[PDB]
Amino acid sequence: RVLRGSRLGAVSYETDRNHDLAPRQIARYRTDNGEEFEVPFADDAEIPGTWLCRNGMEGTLIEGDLPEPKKVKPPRTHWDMLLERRSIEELEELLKERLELIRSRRRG
Amino acid sequence: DKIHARSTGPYSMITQQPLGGKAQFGGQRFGEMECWAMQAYGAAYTLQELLTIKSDDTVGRVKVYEAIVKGENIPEPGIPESFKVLLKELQSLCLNVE
Amino acid sequence: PREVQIHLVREVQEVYRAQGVSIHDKHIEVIVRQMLRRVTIIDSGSTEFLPGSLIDRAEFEAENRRVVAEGGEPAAGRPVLMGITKASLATDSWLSAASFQETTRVLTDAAINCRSDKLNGLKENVIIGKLI
Amino acid sequence: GFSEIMRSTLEKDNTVGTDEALLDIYRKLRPGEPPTKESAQTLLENLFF
Amino acid sequence: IENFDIDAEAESLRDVIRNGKGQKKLRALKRLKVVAAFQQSGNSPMGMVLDAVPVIPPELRPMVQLDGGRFATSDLNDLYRRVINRNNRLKRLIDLGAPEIIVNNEKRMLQESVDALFDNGRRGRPVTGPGN
Amino acid sequence: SEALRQARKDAELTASADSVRAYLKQIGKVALLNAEEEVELAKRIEAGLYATQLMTELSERGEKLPAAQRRDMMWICRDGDRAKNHLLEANLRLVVSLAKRYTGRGMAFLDLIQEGNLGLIRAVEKFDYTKGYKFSTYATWWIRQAITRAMADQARTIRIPVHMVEVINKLGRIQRELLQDLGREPTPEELAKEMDITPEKVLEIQQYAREPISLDQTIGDEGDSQLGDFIE
Amino acid sequence: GAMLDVNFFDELRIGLATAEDIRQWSYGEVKKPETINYRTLKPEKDGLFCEKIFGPTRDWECYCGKY
Ligand SMILES: [Zn+2]
């Protein structure tokens, strides 16, 4: 009869010890627009120099640890889409025909 | 078909109220005019119990149960859950509710 | 204003006489005192008022004592009777006023005016669960 | 024919002409588009007849 | 709103309600109400425009599954999804470069989405779903 | 005719409460084109792209730029942009014509239209004129692909990757066809034979297919009775 | 004025929220219209239920399950 539900998460019942914790470092992070952010990592924890902060952007670490700059590639350009079907000499002949077209526009 | 009581049974999902209805254990709807009458008696404390620690104070309810079965004094009612729901909605409507 | 209380009380009580219902008039007289809480204001005078503004008689009296010295131009006041659904809505506690009508227009001015509620009525302390 | 109603409405027509009243009914029916007179005679027959 | 000295129109409206006549005076009064309201508190009309939209915490708009895995949304997730999608699409078209009819149309769609997210049916037709 | 024109121009600009109608009236202002117009505009597009390529290799000091040559190659570079924007503004009506048939299924109409505009951008990017066809035929594939991609992505409250949406649509097409031509309701084992898969996979796909219901419907007989309250 | 809920205020000041206050309240820009993964039933990354943004669904449990 009664329809029941469960939000898919675990609920335990323990003591909130504010005294007996795992000790922990705090890493300061600096974003692109100079925003400071102090992420609490654990003690036994590798600190990534990059971190998506609370700002909604990427915030690098406040030290000069030199993370990897790009490790990426450009997606594609309209010129790449153009070059997949046409020749460089084809586009250069079109460039010369539009040069003559602007010549007829200008002084012809 | 009608006799229907509840000490502590199931609760609602979105709100934290005790889920009424005889299909459940089911509370009683402590409506508006009952709030009026218990205002008119001037009984502030019983109204505070009925609107916080029998209804929506989530951490208050287990402390009430613990104080009863330990036989200790009933603790102070905390903030009701529905008021915090109202506060979060009003903060979510871009209104700084200081 | 005196007779209009005596007009309101006896006329309403005349109905409950007709049904054989004993209502002591001081239960009526609580309501009539609540209706005439506010007077109307037509002059700005000297201290920030508007024509047709409905403000409390005692508060209109309150500002005048501080303003008869340093610019003694009081607001031209007139006691007015305002109705039940209207006198309820023209309260200072916007949180109490939120439970009345189209709650947007209760609130959009309230955040504009930054009107801090003081939780002093027993209606609002019910909502936050304070000891009323 | 035998009423002040028919006299007052015959004088309070303020839209005289057969197809004028056709396109008047049609432009009251459409509003938001150019009309056409021949559809005004038949959409009447469509929507009721 | 950025290039708006509010105090200038405040003093202008002060002068108009001081010296004016007719409904222009009462109209300047009705404007002077909200002008002095913004001038009085520590608010600013910069917040009347919106630059970032907050999200209500997700337990208040939960997605609970039932027996047989029947999920139950909370009808705000669809509005939030529409606003999120329109903002992402607008960002993509802005970084791409598009004709301004497309860009302004996407901005208008974003605006209508935010407006319906706050109050569905306040402007235009109300956004409905299954069963209308 | 001036009376019907006057009444139509009076009744045409009343409210404009519909943003879809406003967008329709907005995009109806640019004129259509033909094949040689497409050829000319695409020539301008490729010329401006080669112009900005020459500018890109000219960004380092490969050549001393003359004033007239710098300004006319920049003229060509912006000219290709003008031609491309002209083409997109021409074919927005084609986008409307395609999007008008895939409504009534989850998504919003202007959102479908804008995703079709993105697909139209990709089509006019990857469009060739030396192949010598109408632009609309080639653009139709890209626009309908972007439309189906958007309807697979952003039309459900839970995101489903597009292949599972495709097999859900294939199952639904097969199921409607089987309920029609079989006359009665199909068995899932017969459906699993039909799509050459396992019945347990059919059951998992049907389990994925169930869209969630909202909690904000008046499910009880009372209008104030909320469905979200009656959940243990 | 403290929101730390000690059950005494005597004051409640509504007001307009600036864009700075809106970005001050939050815990990261939610940036994807993905609510719950259809297979694992766990909240998606940076979507409308993302545990990095809001918090964990399992008590004192990090999402990968390390701590
Ligand atoms: Zn984890």
Side-chain angles (χ1 to χ4, degrees), chain A residues 2-69 72-108, chain B, chain C residues 1-91 93-132, chain D residues 1-19 21-23 25-49, chain E residues 1-25 27-132, chain F residues 1-3 5-7 9 11-63 65-195 197-217 220 223 225-232, chain G residues 1-9 11-67:
Chain A
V2 43
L3 48 103
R4 86 196 59 222
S6 99
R7 300 187 292 259
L8 312 174
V11 174
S12 170
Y13 27 88
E14 317 196 40
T15 76
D16 223 347
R17 301 157 298 133
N18 238 1
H19 55 93
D20 189 10
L21 291 324
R24 63 262 184 103
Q25 296 167 353
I26 290 166
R28 268 209 160 83
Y29 281 91
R30 187 259 178 195
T31 81
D32 310 334
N33 44 346
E35 317 285 335
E36 313 301 313
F37 284 101
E38 306 142 345
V39 172
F41 297 97
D43 263 347
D44 178 30
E46 217 299 306
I47 310 155
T50 52
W51 174 260
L52 189 135
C53 283
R54 196 190 130 270
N55 202 7
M57 52 208 56
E58 169 52 53
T60 187
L61 206 150
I62 204 176
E63 262 70 57
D65 305 325
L66 202 280
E68 152 68 29
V72 280
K73 99 278 187 187
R76 239 177 305 174
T77 87
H78 198 185
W79 146 252
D80 321 344
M81 267 89 75
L82 176 58
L83 193 267
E84 88 177 2
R85 77 267 180 109
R86 293 315 174 87
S87 158
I88 312 162
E89 303 92 354
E90 157 72 26
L91 303 169
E92 191 170 359
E93 292 332 286
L94 248 71
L95 187 89
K96 292 307 126 177
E97 97 202 17
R98 272 312 185 277
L99 205 138
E100 277 205 351
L101 207 140
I102 214 170
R103 152 177 322 158
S104 160
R105 214 274 332 272
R106 172 115 71 87
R107 91 293 318 260
Chain B
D1 316 336
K2 312 299 183 196
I3 175 173
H4 163 253
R6 153 181 183 128
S7 82
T8 301
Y11 286 75
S12 152
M13 181 50 86
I14 330 168
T15 167
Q16 273 303 307
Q17 287 149 353
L19 174 48
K22 212 216 184 316
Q24 297 81 238
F25 283 171
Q28 306 312 304
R29 169 145 291 280
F30 191 83
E32 182 181 0
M33 301 159 278
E34 285 84 8
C35 296
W36 294 348
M38 284 186 36
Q39 270 156 332
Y41 279 120
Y45 276 118
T46 315
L47 202 57
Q48 215 188 22
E49 307 256 307
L50 279 172
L51 294 199
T52 57
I53 62 178
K54 305 193 217 167
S55 302
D56 268 348
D57 196 10
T58 308
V59 296
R61 277 183 327 259
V62 289
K63 281 162 213 46
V64 155
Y65 220 104
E66 186 157 1
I68 291 158
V69 198
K70 287 260 258 183
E72 309 168 5
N73 269 324
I74 309 298
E76 240 289 329
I79 301 301
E81 186 71 28
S82 180
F83 168 68
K84 287 128 53 190
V85 163
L86 164 73
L87 223 68
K88 280 292 119 180
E89 282 190 355
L90 277 173
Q91 278 191 359
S92 152
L93 202 265
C94 328
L95 301 180
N96 177 38
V97 192
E98 157 63 40
Chain C
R2 170 72 72 242
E3 190 42 64
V4 87
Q5 288 138 347
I6 312 299
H7 151 68
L8 273 174
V9 161
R10 160 226 39 89
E11 195 70 37
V12 166
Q13 234 284 326
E14 203 260 4
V15 196
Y16 292 146
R17 284 153 171 133
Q19 319 308 113
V21 173
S22 324
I23 289 302
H24 189 278
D25 310 354
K26 93 168 91 184
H27 292 328
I28 292 180
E29 284 148 18
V30 164
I31 310 297
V32 197
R33 178 221 154 88
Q34 264 316 108
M35 286 189 211
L36 316 174
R37 281 296 311 179
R38 286 204 208 274
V39 311
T40 205
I41 286 302
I42 48 170
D43 276 352
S44 290
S46 51
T47 169
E48 194 44 55
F49 289 121
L50 291 98
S53 35
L54 312 175
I55 61 167
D56 159 59
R57 160 175 319 176
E59 206 171 14
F60 157 75
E61 264 208 13
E63 46 92 3
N64 275 156
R65 311 303 104 92
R66 300 129 209 177
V67 86
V68 281
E70 191 183 3
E73 336 297 317
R78 174 65 176 87
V80 283
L81 164 65
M82 63 182 181
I84 278 301
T85 164
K86 199 170 185 175
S88 39
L89 199 275
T91 175
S93 174
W94 51 269
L95 196 65
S96 61
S99 168
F100 279 177
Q101 56 115 335
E102 309 160 347
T103 326
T104 295
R105 218 185 34 85
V106 192
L107 267 64
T108 171
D109 46 348
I112 275 163
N113 302 329
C114 206
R115 192 155 84 208
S116 189
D117 213 322
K118 308 298 290 202
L119 317 162
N120 289 336
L122 46 93
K123 165 71 63 196
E124 318 102 18
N125 294 262
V126 160
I127 296 193
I128 76 165
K130 204 151 261 186
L131 210 51
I132 59 169
Chain D
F2 53 95
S3 89
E4 293 198 3
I5 293 284
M6 61 71 43
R7 286 195 301 117
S8 47
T9 45
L10 173 58
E11 299 326 290
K12 207 46 74 178
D13 39 0
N14 76 83
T15 39
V16 185
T18 68
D19 279 334
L22 266 312
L23 75 102
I25 282 294
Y26 200 72
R27 72 178 282 275
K28 284 182 246 93
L29 212 67
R30 292 296 98 190
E33 212 50 51
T36 173
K37 294 191 190 190
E38 265 68 29
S39 167
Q41 220 279 333
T42 42
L43 190 43
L44 181 267
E45 301 277 329
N46 286 154
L47 209 278
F48 289 107
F49 298 92
Chain E
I1 292 172
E2 156 65 46
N3 48 24
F4 189 80
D5 179 33
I6 182 170
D7 321 317
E9 207 185 16
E11 301 322 295
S12 173
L13 255 49
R14 282 318 156 180
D15 181 72
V16 169
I17 68 100
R18 267 168 242 273
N19 317 323
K21 221 193 163 201
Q23 200 23 72
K24 327 288 145 297
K25 190 134 101 82
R27 188 192 194 89
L29 280 162
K30 292 164 91 155
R31 293 191 70 254
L32 189 41
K33 167 203 295 286
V34 309
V35 161
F38 272 72
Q39 210 177 13
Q40 188 148 2
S41 50
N43 312 324
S44 85
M46 193 38 205
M48 303 181 78
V49 318
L50 233 50
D51 229 329
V53 175
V55 187
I56 167 154
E59 288 307 302
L60 311 168
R61 46 171 175 88
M63 192 166 293
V64 52
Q65 92 156 8
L66 266 76
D67 46 345
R70 278 296 314 200
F71 274 78
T73 85
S74 321
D75 220 345
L76 292 182
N77 314 280
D78 320 342
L79 304 171
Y80 271 112
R81 260 186 40 240
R82 276 150 46 113
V83 172
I84 277 297
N85 269 315
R86 284 178 210 209
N87 193 15
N88 237 336
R89 202 162 322 135
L90 180 64
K91 216 174 302 178
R92 175 143 67 249
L93 293 179
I94 274 176
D95 307 353
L96 168 65
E100 309 310 304
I101 298 107
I102 290 182
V103 193
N104 282 141
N105 169 51
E106 185 57 47
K107 288 176 185 177
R108 176 175 55 241
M109 288 151 59
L110 158 76
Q111 202 61 46
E112 221 284 334
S113 70
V114 168
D115 289 332
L117 152 75
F118 288 161
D119 192 19
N120 191 26
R122 185 68 123 98
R123 198 264 185 234
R125 308 167 291 270
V127 190
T128 70
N132 275 352
Chain F
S1 325
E2 202 85 282
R5 170 86 204 274
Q6 175 51 57
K9 291 320 124 192
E12 203 218 301
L13 317 170
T14 75
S16 199
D18 175 38
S19 169
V20 184
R21 175 254 174 90
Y23 185 69
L24 281 148
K25 161 217 59 189
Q26 172 55 246
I27 66 132
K29 293 152 191 160
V30 201
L32 306 164
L33 291 187
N34 45 46
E36 59 271 28
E37 271 284 335
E38 296 152 6
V39 155
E40 187 66 35
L41 289 209
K43 275 168 180 178
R44 292 181 36 181
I45 281 154
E46 299 195 346
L49 251 63
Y50 199 60
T52 189
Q53 284 309 115
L54 175 57
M55 188 266 298
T56 323
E57 62 192 357
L58 186 44
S59 49
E60 46 94 11
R61 43 101 61 220
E63 216 76 23
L65 250 182
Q69 272 62 38
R70 170 221 207 95
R71 75 106 175 273
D72 86 330
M73 78 178 272
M74 280 318 116
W75 195 94
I76 290 301
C77 181
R78 305 165 256 126
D79 172 89
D81 300 331
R82 295 160 188 129
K84 164 247 291 180
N85 298 304
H86 203 301
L87 210 38
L88 303 143
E89 285 146 0
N91 300 276
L92 282 158
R93 190 174 284 163
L94 174 65
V95 184
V96 167
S97 68
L98 249 198
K100 79 203 298 170
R101 80 187 231 164
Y102 285 164
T103 170
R105 34 201 96 166
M107 299 204 84
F109 190 35
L110 253 171
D111 278 302
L112 292 184
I113 282 155
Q114 275 288 96
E115 293 275 350
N117 298 344
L118 193 129
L120 195 265
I121 290 150
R122 196 64 192 267
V124 88
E125 263 167 327
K126 219 181 141 304
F127 180 56
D128 197 305
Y129 63 94
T130 37
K131 288 209 199 309
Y133 312 108
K134 286 285 182 65
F135 167 74
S136 94
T137 311
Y138 174 69
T140 313
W141 293 115
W142 285 94
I143 287 172
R144 246 209 294 189
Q145 195 270 160
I147 284 170
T148 41
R149 146 85 54 90
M151 289 160 50
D153 266 355
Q154 301 91 15
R156 286 171 146 278
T157 323
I158 53 173
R159 197 197 64 95
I160 308 190
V162 297
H163 47 271
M164 213 60 57
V165 197
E166 179 198 353
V167 306
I168 271 181
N169 293 308
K170 285 169 88 157
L171 171 68
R173 179 156 288 258
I174 285 310
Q175 188 156 15
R176 290 185 305 276
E177 197 166 2
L178 273 174
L179 177 55
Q180 252 303 312
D181 316 343
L182 168 61
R184 60 127 181 136
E185 297 186 339
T187 73
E189 293 82 1
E190 181 260 342
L191 280 140
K193 159 248 162 189
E194 193 48 62
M195 289 216 71
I197 37 173
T198 81
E200 53 271 20
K201 190 89 159 191
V202 167
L203 290 191
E204 291 149 0
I205 281 157
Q206 284 171 346
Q207 265 204 335
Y208 291 154
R210 308 196 328 277
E211 296 195 13
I213 211 155
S214 148
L215 276 180
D216 302 351
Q217 55 172 8
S225 65
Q226 203 44 248
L227 166 60
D229 206 354
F230 311 130
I231 295 188
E232 164 193 4
Chain G
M3 51 99 199
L4 300 178
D5 320 301
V6 205
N7 215 162
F8 66 102
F9 330 111
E11 256 146 348
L12 180 86
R13 189 173 65 209
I14 213 174
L16 208 156
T18 85
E20 239 303 315
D21 268 329
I22 288 178
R23 64 186 27 92
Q24 196 276 128
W25 300 339
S26 152
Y27 286 82
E29 171 194 14
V30 53
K31 45 182 302 161
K32 254 167 214 151
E34 306 162 335
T35 73
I36 279 172
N37 196 26
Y38 80 115
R39 217 137 31 87
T40 190
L41 306 177
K42 296 224 266 169
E44 285 275 344
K45 271 190 102 290
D46 313 335
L48 283 172
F49 285 92
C50 162
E51 292 185 331
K52 155 163 187 180
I53 301 285
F54 308 112
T57 42
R58 308 168 48 86
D59 264 345
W60 294 275
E61 294 203 7
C62 84
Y63 170 64
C64 70
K66 191 202 284 172
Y67 314 97

